Design a protein around this nucleic acid. Structure first.
Ligand SMILES: [Mg+2]
Ligand SMILES: [Mg+2]
Ligand SMILES: [Mg+2]
Ligand SMILES: [Mg+2]
Ligand SMILES: [Mg+2]
Ligand SMILES: [Mg+2]
Ligand SMILES: [Mg+2]
Ligand SMILES: [Mg+2]
Ligand SMILES: [Mg+2]
Ligand SMILES: [Mg+2]
Ligand SMILES: [Mg+2]
Ligand SMILES: [Mg+2]
Ligand SMILES: [Mg+2]
Ligand SMILES: [Mg+2]
Ligand SMILES: [Mg+2]
Ligand SMILES: [Mg+2]
Ligand SMILES: [Mg+2]
Ligand SMILES: [Mg+2]
Ligand SMILES: [Mg+2]
Ligand SMILES: [Mg+2]
Ligand SMILES: [Mg+2]
Ligand SMILES: [Mg+2]
Ligand SMILES: [Mg+2]
Ligand SMILES: [Mg+2]
Ligand SMILES: [Mg+2]
Ligand SMILES: [Mg+2]
Ligand SMILES: [Mg+2]
Ligand SMILES: [Mg+2]
Ligand SMILES: [Mg+2]
Ligand SMILES: [Mg+2]
Ligand SMILES: [Mg+2]
Ligand SMILES: [Mg+2]
Ligand SMILES: [Mg+2]
Ligand SMILES: [Mg+2]
Ligand SMILES: [Mg+2]
Ligand SMILES: [Mg+2]
Ligand SMILES: [Mg+2]
Ligand SMILES: [Mg+2]
Ligand SMILES: [Mg+2]
Ligand SMILES: [Mg+2]
Ligand SMILES: [Mg+2]
Ligand SMILES: [Mg+2]
Ligand SMILES: [Mg+2]
Ligand SMILES: [Mg+2]
Ligand SMILES: [Mg+2]
Ligand SMILES: [Mg+2]
Ligand SMILES: [Mg+2]
Ligand SMILES: [Mg+2]
Ligand SMILES: [Mg+2]
Ligand SMILES: [Mg+2]
Ligand SMILES: [Mg+2]
Ligand SMILES: [Mg+2]
Ligand SMILES: [Mg+2]
Ligand SMILES: [Mg+2]
Ligand SMILES: [Mg+2]
Ligand SMILES: [Mg+2]
Ligand SMILES: [Mg+2]
Ligand SMILES: [Mg+2]
Ligand SMILES: [Mg+2]
Ligand SMILES: [Mg+2]
Ligand SMILES: [Mg+2]
Ligand SMILES: [Mg+2]
Ligand SMILES: [Mg+2]
Ligand SMILES: [Mg+2]
Ligand SMILES: [Mg+2]
Ligand SMILES: [Mg+2]
Ligand SMILES: [Mg+2]
Ligand SMILES: [Mg+2]
Ligand SMILES: [Mg+2]
Ligand SMILES: [Mg+2]
Ligand SMILES: [Mg+2]
Ligand SMILES: [Mg+2]
Ligand SMILES: [Mg+2]
Ligand SMILES: [Mg+2]
Ligand SMILES: [Mg+2]
Ligand SMILES: [Mg+2]
Ligand SMILES: [Mg+2]
Ligand SMILES: [Mg+2]
Ligand SMILES: [Mg+2]
Ligand SMILES: [Mg+2]
Ligand SMILES: [Mg+2]
Ligand SMILES: [Mg+2]
Ligand SMILES: [Mg+2]
Ligand SMILES: [Mg+2]
Ligand SMILES: [Mg+2]
Ligand SMILES: [Mg+2]
Ligand SMILES: [Mg+2]
Ligand SMILES: [Mg+2]
Ligand SMILES: [Mg+2]
Ligand SMILES: [Mg+2]
Ligand SMILES: [Mg+2]
Ligand SMILES: [Mg+2]
Ligand SMILES: [Mg+2]
Ligand SMILES: [Mg+2]
Ligand SMILES: [Mg+2]
Ligand SMILES: [Mg+2]
Ligand SMILES: [Mg+2]
Ligand SMILES: [Mg+2]
Ligand SMILES: [Mg+2]
Ligand SMILES: [Mg+2]
Ligand SMILES: [Mg+2]
Ligand SMILES: [Mg+2]
Ligand SMILES: [Mg+2]
Ligand SMILES: [Mg+2]
Ligand SMILES: [Mg+2]
Ligand SMILES: [Mg+2]
Ligand SMILES: [Mg+2]
Ligand SMILES: [Mg+2]
Ligand SMILES: [Mg+2]
Ligand SMILES: [Mg+2]
Ligand SMILES: [Mg+2]
Ligand SMILES: [Mg+2]
Ligand SMILES: [Mg+2]
Ligand SMILES: [Mg+2]
Ligand SMILES: [Mg+2]
Ligand SMILES: [Mg+2]
Ligand SMILES: [Mg+2]
Ligand SMILES: [Mg+2]
Ligand SMILES: [Mg+2]
Ligand SMILES: [Mg+2]
Ligand SMILES: [Mg+2]
Ligand SMILES: [Mg+2]
Ligand SMILES: [Mg+2]
Ligand SMILES: [Mg+2]
Ligand SMILES: [Mg+2]
Ligand SMILES: [Mg+2]
Ligand SMILES: [Mg+2]
Ligand SMILES: [Mg+2]
Ligand SMILES: [Mg+2]
Ligand SMILES: [Mg+2]
Ligand SMILES: [Mg+2]
Ligand SMILES: [Mg+2]
Ligand SMILES: [Mg+2]
Ligand SMILES: [Mg+2]
Ligand SMILES: [Mg+2]
Ligand SMILES: [Mg+2]
Ligand SMILES: [Mg+2]
Ligand SMILES: [Mg+2]
Ligand SMILES: [Mg+2]
Ligand SMILES: [Mg+2]
Ligand SMILES: [Mg+2]
Ligand SMILES: [Mg+2]
Ligand SMILES: [Mg+2]
Ligand SMILES: [Mg+2]
Ligand SMILES: [Mg+2]
Ligand SMILES: [Mg+2]
Ligand SMILES: [Mg+2]
Ligand SMILES: [Mg+2]
Ligand SMILES: [Mg+2]
Ligand SMILES: [Mg+2]
Ligand SMILES: [Mg+2]
Ligand SMILES: [Mg+2]
Ligand SMILES: [Mg+2]
Ligand SMILES: [Mg+2]
Ligand SMILES: [Mg+2]
Ligand SMILES: [Mg+2]
Ligand SMILES: [Mg+2]
Ligand SMILES: [Mg+2]
Ligand SMILES: [Mg+2]
Ligand SMILES: [Mg+2]
Ligand SMILES: [Mg+2]
Ligand SMILES: [Mg+2]
Ligand SMILES: [Mg+2]
Ligand SMILES: [Mg+2]
Ligand SMILES: [Mg+2]
Ligand SMILES: [Mg+2]
Ligand SMILES: [Mg+2]
Ligand SMILES: [Mg+2]
Ligand SMILES: [Mg+2]
Ligand SMILES: [Mg+2]
Ligand SMILES: [Mg+2]
Ligand SMILES: [Mg+2]
Ligand SMILES: [Mg+2]
Ligand SMILES: [Mg+2]
Ligand SMILES: [Mg+2]
Ligand SMILES: [Mg+2]
Length: 185
RNA sequence: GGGAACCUGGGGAACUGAAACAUCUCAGUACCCAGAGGAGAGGAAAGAGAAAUCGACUCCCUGAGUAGCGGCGAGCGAAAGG
RNA sequence: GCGUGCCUAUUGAAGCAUGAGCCGGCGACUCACGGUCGUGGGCGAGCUUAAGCCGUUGAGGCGGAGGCGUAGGGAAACCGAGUCCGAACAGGGCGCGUCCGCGGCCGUGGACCCGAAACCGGGCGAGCUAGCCCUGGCCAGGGUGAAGCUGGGGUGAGACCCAGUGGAGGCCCGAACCGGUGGGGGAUGCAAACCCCUCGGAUGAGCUGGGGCUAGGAGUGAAAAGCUAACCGAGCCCGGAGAUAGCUGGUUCUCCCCGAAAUGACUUUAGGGUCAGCCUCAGGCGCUGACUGGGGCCUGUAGAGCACUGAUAGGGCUAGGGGGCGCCUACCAAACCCUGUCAAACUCCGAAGGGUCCCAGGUGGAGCCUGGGAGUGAGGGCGCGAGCGAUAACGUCCGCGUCCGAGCGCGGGAACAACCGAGACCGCCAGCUAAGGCCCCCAAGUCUGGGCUAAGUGGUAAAGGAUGUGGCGCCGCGAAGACAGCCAGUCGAGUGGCGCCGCGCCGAAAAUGAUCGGGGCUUAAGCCCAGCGCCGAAGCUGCGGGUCUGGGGGAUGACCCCAGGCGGUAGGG
RNA sequence: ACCGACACAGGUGGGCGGGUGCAAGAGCACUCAGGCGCGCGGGAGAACCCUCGCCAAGGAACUCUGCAAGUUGGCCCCGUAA
RNA sequence: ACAGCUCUCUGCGAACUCGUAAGAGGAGGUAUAGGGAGCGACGCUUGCCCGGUGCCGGAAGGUCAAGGGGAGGGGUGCAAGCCCCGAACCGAAGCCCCGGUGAACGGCGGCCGUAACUAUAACGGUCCUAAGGUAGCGAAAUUCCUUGUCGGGUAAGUUCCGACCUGCACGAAAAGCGUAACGACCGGAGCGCUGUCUCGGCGAGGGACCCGGUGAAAUUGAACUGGCCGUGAAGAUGCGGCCUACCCGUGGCAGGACGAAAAGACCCCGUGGAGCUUUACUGCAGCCUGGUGUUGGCUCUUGGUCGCGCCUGCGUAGGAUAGGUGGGAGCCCGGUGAAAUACCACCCUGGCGCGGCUGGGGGCCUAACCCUCGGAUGGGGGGACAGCGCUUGGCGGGCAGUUUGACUGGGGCGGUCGCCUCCUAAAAGGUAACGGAGGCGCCCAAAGGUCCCCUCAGGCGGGACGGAAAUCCGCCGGAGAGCGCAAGGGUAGAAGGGGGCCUGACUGCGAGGCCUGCAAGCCGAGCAGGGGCGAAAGCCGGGCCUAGUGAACCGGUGGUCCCGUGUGGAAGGGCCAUCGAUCAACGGAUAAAAGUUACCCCGGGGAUAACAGGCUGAUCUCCCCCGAGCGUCCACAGCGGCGGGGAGGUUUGGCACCUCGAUGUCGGCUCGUCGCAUCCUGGGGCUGAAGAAGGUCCCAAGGGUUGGGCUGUUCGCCCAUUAAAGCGGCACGCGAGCUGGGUUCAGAACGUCGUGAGACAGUUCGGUCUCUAUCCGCCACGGGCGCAGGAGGCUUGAGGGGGGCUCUUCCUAGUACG
């Protein structure tokens, strides 16, 4: 309706496009010495792919492994029933109310199968935003042309978007930016 | 054919002014062409204009910046009669 | 010792804004006809003549056509000291010189003087340059080797293939010839388009000699708005023409008097103008002026205040509403109540002030009236009060005021339009004072008592730190003699604690060489509270002199006394 | 001696335009016939500039850019890809 | 430009062009040709949308200018008359309307939902359209984010090439995608070779310099012309305090004299100027078009129409095809109906019958006009047409003259432009800003006059339908209701709520004020005239009150007395009443008007922008306070919430004070110099310091602070090293020292917007950078004099300047610590 609520409907409409970015990184075979790499998992349970960060508690004991202290025995049961079913290629455990799964890093060829695809979400992410800028500015057009402004009352708008788009595009380049280390280094 | 201007006919601007500008103005000016000559034109009423009047024409002074004309603006502007 | 050129334009210039090498000459508010005034004469209920006519050879008459003036009022008819609107016989609106000379200003003409970009007419150019027509030349040498023909090959006949001859082409290489790619030079040149190296085309849409043709809103153009006689978005010359310029510049002798504005209103107006405001001169009226005292009103700001309007933190009381809902539990939460507050657009209340009317003082480059001449209509700083700004700006708009402008004349402030003092006729080798100062530069107290400060603070900064120092307080409570060390007695006294006042330290880094104006100051040459004295300006007295008004001498003699004003740009006299 | 304000480093159509050598030629070099030595000179031997010759090693690090400069260059003969 | 493609025009006296015309090109041509337009060999191709626009086609209708036409009206004369307006209706072109048309101007979308991992969406629903971009191409001479991501080339590649397509904003004849051959065209690589460079050196010639001859120019207030901190109109040789410094030159260097040269080219202002554009205004040329003059014959055929002759009207009964009103009875009523006939009439309805006056059409003609033919007194063909005169209406950037407002913290854009109500506003008024927050361009025949009465809003209880208000009753409540609508003031002792009569919401006027520059606006006593209500004293010339509106000019309607061009009356004026304005840019230039320039010009300005300086310091970089809370314990080893205080003038800004008769504007090169907040190397302090390393704070600039790739880049980003590869000041130092890659002149193109000419803080290739230094300053080298005799030598050094760096390794010692 106006720049006021708009400049915020971008910092809200760009948020999500960023969201997924994080999402598509953890789903990646990093040093896999992290728990979150699991919780996202849509685990089929009681008739609904239910995110693991809701069916249990994953926390890697040490670097070399993770534990899913799955409260209810049964839950844990139908849990493995999905952490493996991921092409990845791991194997957990039916030990106690928890799930012991190893973390085995691998070859360089495994680095391209991980690093290359990342410098790909690097795009899907930067871009998803690029559009929240394209689609933004356009409503900024019809806006000050409906509402009346100055060729400058508008530039202020026009570039603010830009400073916002740029501000958010950072929480991306710079985001994955770190995990790239957890992957590489 | 020529002739310093001066005169008549045939054509004929704009800048300007109106504090813009198109009617209007400058202006029938400038200039162009023809023609007449010591001058040229005009000249004996199919006039004038309200006076039982006047009596070819042309020039001067008044009439008069009047009567009027006018995007009733800028501005233009007679005639009878004396 | 003291001292920032001249003009110009400006809120403001020495200005690092404008113009000017220097000297001499030329060089800009005029005339004509109308108007409006003031003024010197003539004639007066009238005054005066235009063209023309007669005389003159630097004689003046005559000429009353005509023009103003004697009545105004009404759109007009018309009426008339009235008239007009009107039914009114209410009312209301309008009511007494010419002719010359001269000065001021206005209208009109180029009308203060220069200066455009352009516009319009008539002409002059294609001996440059563009296109084209006619008639003539020119293009070393080398290269590749098309079509054609001819001989052989193949076929049913062919097509088609081979050699050979042959000599095509907006073909190739490269001089002349015609261009002008890239670079350097040249840049008051060799030259207002050049030179050197380099590079393109060179039988073609080629280059060139002579003769011809098309032109100014026109030509011509392998197209750039290119070219048309070295500048072309419309050539050149001549005339209209002294186009117009709400802009820029310039605008000449002296002394005297007064002196602005930089605002309001309306402007296709906003750096212009019309009216008003403010200056000035004339004549007219004469204490009403500015300012002050005393009285009587209107008034709604500074404060303050919640009675309205609204906002407000908390607490109580209590709807209705959360959560168990039945009791209860959190002001989560309306009105109400106190408790404390907030507000340009709230005020129960309300100042000081301001304004205004009658009376009183008030003789002043006061006012009030009629009129001639204006300029100005960018303002700027500073105090105060408000907006905008960010409780920013040498910011910005307003308000009272002031000062600069125009007081850049003088002292102080180091230097400096507006900060302090203070209104500069002139002259003097006099004297006392303002502001500021009084140790040396530099005038006058290293003046006198009384403290404070040790950082050069002074000599120019904050929140906030800190037993820096000097001076006050009330608090403990130490013979129920610990406050500091050594087992606590001896030791036998000033030790803890907050918190106020003065000066001070830290906090605290900037760009060419440093500093408070310099030197140099510490019981000061700093700072605070006292006291007497000097210095110091163009301020005021002293002596003399110039000048204009006002007021008396006065025998006008313009000739001495008397009391005042005399900075000044635009401007007026 | 013509057009360029000049005794101008620019411009101006046609014919002749020798010899030797170089693949040829009106190209280049030298020189016949012929003409000229450009209407200020003399010295010195710095910076710097103009125009010109050279370089160790490196060989585009230069720079906007190999701009410039260098390399290659004639003829004969092989031999020449997409 | 080009061949070549396409659309289009043109039947010959061609179209088109020049010209007033004659005439001429066209062309001594004839559609296999000529003109106009776009595209630009050649290969494959060239989609969809005729709603709007243009053009082609439509013998019907709609509208329409003259002219024809005259029902009807007015003016005058005693009149025959003469004069005027004047409806029907017939009337071109154009426009409207109906079709067609894209190698004509042009145009060629969006929003929801859905696949058994997810994603995504072939598929569905839906909104609008004239129809929603096909082939091919794609971060491109087009891609804003952008150096998009990947891959290749490189040590390293914002460029380049290959891909992906999320095409800000390709795309089919302003052509699309390709293409061998071609280019002094623009980009990326290589190899060869070099002074281009690291990195500078030597040498040659012509100048520069010295000597003899000749001998300029721009500029120039006057000169006796130094540095620093200050200062001043805010960048000083010329003021102030201080600091230096003998006089005068020769060769050089360029930092300064805001150096010179151009009355700034950008910027704005001027109601300044030109070239251009169009669906801005207005006209002109030309073209189309009706009537006519030129201009005539003979026929065919239908109109409008006035003279006339005639026939002509079938409601229900009916003597039945009554038109109508009169006369009227021999050439009938009757009976009945709305009306009675046998007959003569005057006329509405309507058609035919011979004439007039005029019209329109379609034919043939020849003899005017035209063109032609071995030279014609004539013959061919066209033919009342064409051409030409006049007049009617329209098309008409082809051409012309012009208009395209102002304010405004430059301008443009956005906003506003008059009136009303508060505050601002400092206790009379008044009063600024693009200051804060709202209204008006009306409404009322009752909402008005006056007389007569009556009184709210809310609150609490009682109450049939009944919220928390319908309507009743009951107390209480001075004002918070109401007062037509904004706001303020006022108000119940009425302006409010209700009832009764009325139309003073009059005509004549107006003492006297308010306000005020003018002109406008504002209240209004009372007299006269005739009225309304009231018993009356009395009130009523509009509305509780301020907004609710517009000078004159020009026309329009009414009326009255005045004028009425020899006189009379008219035509037409005046006076009075009243009307036509978003003249709303609202004190109003015209009846009448938009753009554009980088093709541009003049006059002006630092009255006003961009660069730079200055003031400011929000923003900016920096350091400081308070100390939540992180640090395994523990505010400060290292950190710091929310919050607060300052410093600096390097960022982005605000202001517009110098300079617009000119202060050359990014980057690079060269030469630097200064600050410390320090990147190295020196010292030191704590450390959550073992050592070796670091972290962090404190001192401290003396000196150092590399070479490359990319980009114009500064800045970054990488490659290889380093003790380190520090930030910032000097007009973001430095163009009279160089460079011009960037950027802002003219050329061209892409995307883009625009109908257009042209435009763009978009791109892209191109594109002129001025021999002489006089003064200050600086580098060198002199002449003069001075230094109280005149000399030849050798030194003293007050004073200044140059220079100061840093790494690696080996011993100590593999020791100390571990
Ligand atoms: Mg003659
Ligand atoms: Mg005019
Ligand atoms: Mg006009
Ligand atoms: Mg005109
Ligand atoms: Mg004679
Ligand atoms: Mg005669
Ligand atoms: Mg006769
Ligand atoms: Mg005469
Ligand atoms: Mg008269
Ligand atoms: Mg006469
Ligand atoms: Mg001096
Ligand atoms: Mg002047
Ligand atoms: Mg100024
Ligand atoms: Mg000077
Ligand atoms: Mg200047
Ligand atoms: Mg000067
Ligand atoms: Mg000037
Ligand atoms: Mg001179
Ligand atoms: Mg002189
Ligand atoms: Mg007068
Ligand atoms: Mg007199
Ligand atoms: Mg006489
Ligand atoms: Mg009357
Ligand atoms: Mg001009
Ligand atoms: Mg002309
Ligand atoms: Mg001629
Ligand atoms: Mg010629
Ligand atoms: Mg010629
Ligand atoms: Mg050739
Ligand atoms: Mg050429
Ligand atoms: Mg060649
Ligand atoms: Mg010739
Ligand atoms: Mg040509
Ligand atoms: Mg062109
Ligand atoms: Mg020329
Ligand atoms: Mg004239
Ligand atoms: Mg003049
Ligand atoms: Mg004087
Ligand atoms: Mg005075
Ligand atoms: Mg105006
Ligand atoms: Mg005035
Ligand atoms: Mg106040
Ligand atoms: Mg409450
Ligand atoms: Mg309350
Ligand atoms: Mg008195
Ligand atoms: Mg007085
Ligand atoms: Mg003013
Ligand atoms: Mg001003
Ligand atoms: Mg100010
Ligand atoms: Mg003064
Ligand atoms: Mg002076
Ligand atoms: Mg001074
Ligand atoms: Mg004085
Ligand atoms: Mg002394
Ligand atoms: Mg003394
Ligand atoms: Mg003491
Ligand atoms: Mg520092
Ligand atoms: Mg000192
Ligand atoms: Mg004392
Ligand atoms: Mg005296
Ligand atoms: Mg006296
Ligand atoms: Mg005085
Ligand atoms: Mg004066
Ligand atoms: Mg005077
Ligand atoms: Mg010449
Ligand atoms: Mg010459
Ligand atoms: Mg010579
Ligand atoms: Mg010569
Ligand atoms: Mg020749
Ligand atoms: Mg040879
Ligand atoms: Mg030769
Ligand atoms: Mg010579
Ligand atoms: Mg070498
Ligand atoms: Mg070497
Ligand atoms: Mg390089
Ligand atoms: Mg480089
Ligand atoms: Mg580069
Ligand atoms: Mg390049
Ligand atoms: Mg490059
Ligand atoms: Mg080269
Ligand atoms: Mg190849
Ligand atoms: Mg092949
Ligand atoms: Mg055609
Ligand atoms: Mg012919
Ligand atoms: Mg083309
Ligand atoms: Mg095909
Ligand atoms: Mg269409
Ligand atoms: Mg159609
Ligand atoms: Mg048709
Ligand atoms: Mg007619
Ligand atoms: Mg009659
Ligand atoms: Mg028609
Ligand atoms: Mg969906
Ligand atoms: Mg499913
Ligand atoms: Mg669908
Ligand atoms: Mg679609
Ligand atoms: Mg399709
Ligand atoms: Mg593509
Ligand atoms: Mg792409
Ligand atoms: Mg790229
Ligand atoms: Mg491409
Ligand atoms: Mg883009
Ligand atoms: Mg590589
Ligand atoms: Mg695009
Ligand atoms: Mg598109
Ligand atoms: Mg198409
Ligand atoms: Mg097209
Ligand atoms: Mg292509
Ligand atoms: Mg080329
Ligand atoms: Mg070097
Ligand atoms: Mg030499
Ligand atoms: Mg200074
Ligand atoms: Mg210099
Ligand atoms: Mg000069
Ligand atoms: Mg100028
Ligand atoms: Mg100019
Ligand atoms: Mg301009
Ligand atoms: Mg012109
Ligand atoms: Mg017949
Ligand atoms: Mg008839
Ligand atoms: Mg009859
Ligand atoms: Mg019956
Ligand atoms: Mg009978
Ligand atoms: Mg009839
Ligand atoms: Mg015939
Ligand atoms: Mg015939
Ligand atoms: Mg005809
Ligand atoms: Mg035009
Ligand atoms: Mg206008
Ligand atoms: Mg502005
Ligand atoms: Mg007041
Ligand atoms: Mg007041
Ligand atoms: Mg309104
Ligand atoms: Mg009422
Ligand atoms: Mg009810
Ligand atoms: Mg209303
Ligand atoms: Mg009534
Ligand atoms: Mg009354
Ligand atoms: Mg009323
Ligand atoms: Mg008018
Ligand atoms: Mg009119
Ligand atoms: Mg008459
Ligand atoms: Mg208007
Ligand atoms: Mg106005
Ligand atoms: Mg008005
Ligand atoms: Mg008008
Ligand atoms: Mg251009
Ligand atoms: Mg040009
Ligand atoms: Mg052009
Ligand atoms: Mg031009
Ligand atoms: Mg200024
Ligand atoms: Mg600050
Ligand atoms: Mg903070
Ligand atoms: Mg602060
Ligand atoms: Mg600064
Ligand atoms: Mg400025
Ligand atoms: Mg300045
Ligand atoms: Mg000058
Ligand atoms: Mg200047
Ligand atoms: Mg320690
Ligand atoms: Mg340093
Ligand atoms: Mg660079
Ligand atoms: Mg790389
Ligand atoms: Mg620097
Ligand atoms: Mg130079
Ligand atoms: Mg320069
Ligand atoms: Mg310079
Ligand atoms: Mg460039
Ligand atoms: Mg260039
Ligand atoms: Mg460029
Ligand atoms: Mg531009
Ligand atoms: Mg377009
Ligand atoms: Mg080039
Ligand atoms: Mg220059
Ligand atoms: Mg020299
Ligand atoms: Mg030393």
């Amino acid at each position: 309706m106006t720049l006021k609520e708009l400049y915020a409907e971008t910092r809200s409409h760009m948020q999500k496009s960023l969201e997924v970015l994080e999402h598509n990184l953890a789903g990646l075979r990093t040093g896999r010495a992290n728990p979150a790499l699991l919780l996202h998992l849509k685990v089929e349970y009681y008739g609904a792919h239910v995110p693991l960060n809701q069916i249990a508690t994953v926390t890697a004991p040490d670097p070399r492994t993770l534990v899913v202290q799955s409260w209810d025995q049964n839950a844990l049961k139908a849990i493995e029933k999905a952490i493996r079913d991921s092409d990845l290629g791991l194997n957990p455990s039916n030990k106690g109310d928890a799930l012991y799964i190893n973390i085995p890093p691998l070859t360089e060829e495994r680095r391209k199968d991980l690093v290359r695809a990342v410098r790909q979400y690097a795009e899907e992410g930067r871009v998803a935003i690029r559009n929240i800028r394209r689609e933004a500015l356009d409503k900024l057009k019809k806006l000050a042309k409906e509402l009346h402004l100055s060729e400058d009352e508008t530039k202020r708008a026009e570039a603010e978007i830009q400073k916002i788009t740029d501000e958010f595009i950072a929480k991306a380049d710079q985001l994955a930016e770190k995990k790239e280390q957890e992957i590489l280094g």
